[PDB]
Amino acid sequence: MQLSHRPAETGDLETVAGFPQDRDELFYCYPKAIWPFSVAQLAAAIAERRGSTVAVHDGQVLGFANFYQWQHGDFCALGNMMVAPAARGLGVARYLIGVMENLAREQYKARLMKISCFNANAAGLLLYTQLGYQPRAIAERHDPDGRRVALIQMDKPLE
Ligand SMILES: CC(=O)SCCNC(=O)CCNC(=O)[C@H](O)C(C)(C)COP(=O)(O)OP(=O)(O)OC[C@H]1O[C@@H](n2cnc3c(N)ncnc32)[C@H](O)[C@@H]1OP(=O)(O)O
Numbered sequence: 565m566q567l568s569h570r571p572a573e574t575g576d577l578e579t580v581a582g583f584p585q586d587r588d589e590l591f592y593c594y595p596k597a598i599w600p601f602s603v604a605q606l607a608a609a610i611a612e613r614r615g616s617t618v619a620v621h622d623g624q625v626l627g628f629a630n631f632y633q634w635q636h637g638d639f640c641a642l643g644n645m646m647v648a649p650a651a652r653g654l655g656v657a658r659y660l661i662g663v664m665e666n667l668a669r670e671q672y673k674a675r676l677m678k679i680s681c682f683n684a685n686a687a688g689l690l691l692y693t694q695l696g697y698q699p700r701a702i703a704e705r706h707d708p709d710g711r712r713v714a715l716i717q718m719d720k721p722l723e
């Protein structure tokens with residue numbers, strides 16, 4: 565998987581808004597969104613966030629991520645991490661997380677990256693563990709059916 569990256573563009577949003585395959589996946593990567601996902605919901609997140617970036621391979625947009633918190637000299641918090649279903653398990657998220665780590669360091673002078681994953685998202689928890697993130701805290705949250713879930717907050721030093 566040779567991959568490139570660039571800022572997200574308007575024409576990318578239809579494709580990216582197709583990445584979550586079901587209500588669970590949408591909850592995991594964007595818990596304030598409501599199913600079905602739409603370009604309007606994606607565009608609204610982009611407008612409130614920073615660093616919205618796509619990963620591209622062989623002319624296809626395969627991954628998306630951004631920051632929902634940014635604090636210069638301090639940390640960024642990575643969210644909306646989503647990969648095309650036909651392209652999972654090929655390193656897209658690993659590549660994109662590295663690009664976002666570099667952007668945090670270079671543009672934000674961040675010392676730390678924060679992420680939070682819902683307990684049911686095994687793939688996400690294992691992704692960030694593989695990339696050297698460690699768990700710090702667990703917070704109670706609710707899913708769209710009002711059921712109690714656990715949000716696992718993790719972080720990683722950027723040096
Ligand atoms: C902070 C957040 O935004 S959390 C939200 C994460 N997003 C979602 O859950 C939305 C739906 N899911 C997806 O988009 C994807 O499955 C992602 C983002 C979780 C993973 O993206 P991928 O590009 O498939 O992951 P990538 O291939 O880069 O794998 C990197 C690591 O993730 C983990 N991983 C990825 N998929 C799986 C899986 N199906 N089962 C177990 N571990 C997995 C492994 O640790 C893997 O490392 P390895 O292959 O060296 O063992």
Ligand SMILES: [Cl-]
Binds near residue numbers: 593643
């Ligand atoms: Cl998010």
